[PDB]
């Protein structure tokens, strides 16, 4: 009735040190032992691990007094705020919340997101020079810094990134997140504290600038080009009327730049070192740049719209090195799984990771071969054989801007550079909350228009 368990190397302790060495590896070996369903106790949760594409309707269609994310994902709390996503005081908030944030990711702004990336990438490039070599993870990190500071934030942010050392503080509060938060929310933290208030009074101070800047022109209040996250949280109320806090609207924005940075430059690191490691996807791909440029020089949104092939690459990289590489909800209630019963208090846990190498979905899946979606639609042949981005009532908001993101970062960059990749793809580096490749990953460049 409940499900086959995962025998304990220790009581407590239970399953962890295996899970902690590689947890991709962990469920696929217990799949293999167990099936479809098991148990574990891990540092003393019980995580019932869901591992086969068919069975997960009744975890992604649940609401959320049945499947609660945020019984598991409240010791983000130090990092986004008391009383901010899933320190929300409720469902209903948290999702008011939300909605904040997706309301700066429209259209009109994608249009204005596009110029952005063409400005910092060309900043960039100064850096770089004619040629070189360069690690991918951290130019992408640190072009995404300055893009997704800027789109969500306005261009206001930009003279504390270069003037204020705000990227710097960004790393340091992302250097204190630890996975094993997630078992001990109580593990301090002191140099993250001390930057999360160091970005605090930053945004509080941006927010009080942009206040005095809506009092002298109400006008950039009417153009839908211009409003911003920061905006929106300065002149909407909660449905009930309550307003905003400060405090909340700070919190809202800091989860917003970690959603909008992390997961994407970690996507586009792995999207562009596979791309310019197979001869013939980059031929493809550039074969699609050229043919949407033209005679024209810059992007535009409706170009980034056409880019379907690199599109493909980039959900290619998102089956194989998916950045959240688990999904988490506590049972509030028993949940009926095939012909078990999973007991109120159990952690459910689906895989990103485990399903994009599940050979019942993919042929041949350690192979990146964007043709895979394209031709064969091999993702299409379960409902959930492909969930990058999740699924239901919680799937990704950020999901057009991620592609517009590392699209354009991506299109840009070829544009500019012939690259090689230096060595073997490495393989995922379970050290972080959003997993990303092992360094060290370094590219040559050269310009291909010197002079
Ligand atoms: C390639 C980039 C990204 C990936 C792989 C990604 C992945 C995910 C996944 C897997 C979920 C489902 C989580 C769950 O069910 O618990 C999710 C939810 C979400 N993502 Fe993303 N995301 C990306 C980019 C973004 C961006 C750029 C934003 C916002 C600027 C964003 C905002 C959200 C939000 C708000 C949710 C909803 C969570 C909830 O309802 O509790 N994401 N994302
Ligand atoms: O950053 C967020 O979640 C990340 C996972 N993620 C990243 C991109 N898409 C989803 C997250 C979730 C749980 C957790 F424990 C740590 C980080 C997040 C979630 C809900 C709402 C928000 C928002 F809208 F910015 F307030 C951000
Ligand atoms: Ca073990
Ligand atoms: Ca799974």
């Given at each position: 009735?409940?499900?086959?368990?995962?025998?304990?190397?220790?009581?407590?302790?239970?399953?962890?040190?295996?899970?902690?060495?590689?947890?991709?590896?962990?469920?696929?070996?217990?799949?293999?032992?167990?099936?479809?369903?098991?148990?574990?106790?891990?540092?003393?949760?019980?995580?019932?691990?869901?591992?086969?594409?068919?069975?997960?309707?009744?975890?992604?269609?649940?609401?959320?007094?049945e499947?609660?994310?945020?019984?598991?994902?409240?010791?983000?709390?130090?990092?986004?705020?008391?009383?901010?996503?899933?320190?929300?005081?409720?469902?209903?908030?948290?999702?008011?919340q939300?909605?904040?944030?997706?309301s700066?990711?429209?259209?009109?702004?994608?249009?204005?997101f596009?110029?952005?990336?063409?400005?910092?990438?060309?900043?960039?490039?100064?850096?770089?020079?004619?040629?070189?070599?360069?690690?991918?993870?951290?130019?992408?990190?640190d072009?995404?810094?300055?893009?997704?500071?800027?789109?969500?934030?306005?261009?206001?942010?930009?003279?504390?990134?270069?003037?204020?050392?705000?990227?710097?503080?960004?790393?340091?509060?992302?250097?204190?997140?630890?996975?094993?938060?997630?078992?001990?929310?109580?593990?301090?933290?002191?140099?993250?504290?001390?930057?999360?208030?160091?970005?605090?009074?930053?945004?509080?101070?941006?927010?009080?600038?942009?206040?005095?800047?809506?009092?002298?022109?109400?006008?950039?209040?009417?153009?839908?080009?211009?409003?911003?996250?920061?905006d929106?949280?300065?002149?909407?109320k909660?449905?009930?009327?309550?307003?905003?806090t400060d405090?909340h609207?700070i919190?809202?924005?800091?989860?917003?730049?970690?959603?909008?940075?992390?997961?994407?430059?970690?996507?586009?690191?792995?999207?562009?070192?596979?791309?310019?490691?197979?001869?013939?996807?980059?031929?493809?791909?550039?074969?699609?740049?050229?043919?949407?440029?033209?005679?024209?020089?810059?992007?535009?949104?409706?170009?980034?719209?056409?880019?379907?092939?690199?599109?493909?690459?980039?959900?290619?990289?998102?089956?194989?090195?998916?950045?959240?590489?688990?999904?988490?909800?506590?049972?509030?209630?028993?949940?009926?799984?095939?012909?078990?019963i999973?007991?109120?208090?159990?952690?459910?846990?689906?895989?990103?990771?485990?399903?994009?190498?599940?050979?019942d979905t993919?042929?041949?899946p350690?192979?990146?071969?964007?043709?895979?979606?394209?031709?064969?639609?091999?993702?299409?042949?379960?409902?959930?054989?492909?969930?990058?981005?999740?699924?239901?009532?919680?799937?990704?908001?950020?999901?057009?801007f991620?592609?517009?993101?590392?699209?354009?970062?991506?299109?840009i960059l070829?544009?500019?550079?012939?690259?090689?990749?230096?060595?073997?793809?490495?393989?995922?580096?379970?050290?972080?909350?959003?997993?990303?490749?092992?360094?060290?990953?370094?590219?040559?460049?050269?310009?291909?228009?010197?002079?």
């Amino acid at each position: 009735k409940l499900p086959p368990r995962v025998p304990n190397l220790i009581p407590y302790v239970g399953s962890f040190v295996s899970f902690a060495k590689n947890p991709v590896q962990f469920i696929i070996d217990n799949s293999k032992k167990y099936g479809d369903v098991f148990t574990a106790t891990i540092l003393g949760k019980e995580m019932t691990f869901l591992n086969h594409p068919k069975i997960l309707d009744t975890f992604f269609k649940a609401t959320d007094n049945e499947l609660s994310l945020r019984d598991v994902y409240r010791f983000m709390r130090p990092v986004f705020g008391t009383g901010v996503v899933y320190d929300a005081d409720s469902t209903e908030r948290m999702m008011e919340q939300v909605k904040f944030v997706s309301s700066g990711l429209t259209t009109a702004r994608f249009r204005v997101f596009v110029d952005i990336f063409e400005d910092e990438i060309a900043h960039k490039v100064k850096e770089l020079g004619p040629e070189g070599t360069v690690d991918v993870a951290e130019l992408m990190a640190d072009l995404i810094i300055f893009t997704a500071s800027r789109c969500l934030l306005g261009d206001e942010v930009r003279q504390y990134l270069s003037e204020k050392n705000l990227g710097k503080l960004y790393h340091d509060i992302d250097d204190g997140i630890s996975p094993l938060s997630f078992f001990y929310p109580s593990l301090p933290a002191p140099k993250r504290d001390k930057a999360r208030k160091a970005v605090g009074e930053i945004f509080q101070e941006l927010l009080d600038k942009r206040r005095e800047e809506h009092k002298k022109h109400p006008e950039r209040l009417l153009d839908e080009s211009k409003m911003d996250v920061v905006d929106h949280l300065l002149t909407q109320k909660y449905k009930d009327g309550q307003e905003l806090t400060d405090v909340h609207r700070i919190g809202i924005l800091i989860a917003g730049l970690f959603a909008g940075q992390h997961t994407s430059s970690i996507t586009s690191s792995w999207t562009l070192m596979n791309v310019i490691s197979n001869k013939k996807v980059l031929e493809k791909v550039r074969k699609e740049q050229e043919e949407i440029m033209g005679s024209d020089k810059v992007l535009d949104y409706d170009k980034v719209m056409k880019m379907d092939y690199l599109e493909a690459c980039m959900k290619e990289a998102l089956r194989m090195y998916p950045p959240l590489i688990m999904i988490m909800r506590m049972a509030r209630k028993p949940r009926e799984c095939e012909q078990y019963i999973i007991p109120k208090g159990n952690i459910l846990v689906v895989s990103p990771s485990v399903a994009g190498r599940c050979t019942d979905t993919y042929t041949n899946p350690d192979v990146f071969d964007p043709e895979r979606l394209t031709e064969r639609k091999e993702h299409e042949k379960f409902k959930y054989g492909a969930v990058p981005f999740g699924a239901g009532r919680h799937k990704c908001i950020g999901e057009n801007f991620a592609l517009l993101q590392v699209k354009s970062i991506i299109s840009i960059l070829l544009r500019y550079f012939d690259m090689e990749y230096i060595g073997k793809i490495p393989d995922p580096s379970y050290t972080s909350l959003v997993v990303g490749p092992s360094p060290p990953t370094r590219m040559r460049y050269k310009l291909r228009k010197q002079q």
